[PDB]
Design a binder for this molecule. Structure first.
Ligand SMILES: O=C(O)c1ccc(C(=O)Nc2ccc(O[C@H]3O[C@H](CO)[C@@H](O)[C@H](O)[C@@H]3O)c(Cl)c2)cc1
Length: 158
């Protein structure tokens, strides 16, 4: 089991870290959601699907910077939504193919009442998402740590 990103980096068997750079909507209004879709950013596969079934969760999602100070919201993982920043580990998604498969995570972030002007700065860390991979074969339990950065400013109009 290993993963790759839309920025051309990887995390191998056994886990590790990577940076992810996301283009964000430049304007998000109060009462609306900024969508941060990681399924177009992070892709993984199973290295021995003939025998082994891989299981993958979002173990943890944390907010930083302007997201932490100016937004609330949720994370959608494989069709179900949960609070973000996270308060539990999600259910597992099965990876059962050598073919790349997106990691089905998206953040839905809404600006808090006090937000205005530039609410997320270009280049800033917005989130850390921890993917936890196990299987039905051995005792492997690996963390793939995704540091999510904004590629651009996000403004919340007054
Ligand atoms: O035809 C043959 O002779 C043959 C075929 C296959 C193998 C084999 O044993 N292959 C093999 C490949 C990868 C393996 O582990 C990694 O990938 C799995 C599946 O994603 C992960 O769950 C796991 O955490 C880890 O990342 C493991 Cl334990 C085993 C040996 C011999």
């Amino acid at each position: 089991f290993a993963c790759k990103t839309a920025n051309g980096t990887a995390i191998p068997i056994g886990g590790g870290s990577a940076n992810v750079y996301v283009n964000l909507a430049p304007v998000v209004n109060v009462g609306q959601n900024l969508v941060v879709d990681l399924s177009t950013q992070i892709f993984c596969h199973n290295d021995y699907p003939e025998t082994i079934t891989d299981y993958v969760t979002l173990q943890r999602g944390s907010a930083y910077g302007g997201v932490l100070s100016n937004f609330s919201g949720t994370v959608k993982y494989s069709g179900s939504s949960y609070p973000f920043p996270t308060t539990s580990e999600t259910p597992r998604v099965v990876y059962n193919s050598r073919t790349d498969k997106p990691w089905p995570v998206a953040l839905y972030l809404t600006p808090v009442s006090s937000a205005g002007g530039v609410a997320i700065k270009a280049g800033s860390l917005i989130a850390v998402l921890i993917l936890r991979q196990t299987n039905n074969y051995n005792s492997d339990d690996f963390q793939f740590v995704w540091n999510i950065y904004a590629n651009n400013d996000v403004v919340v109009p007054t």
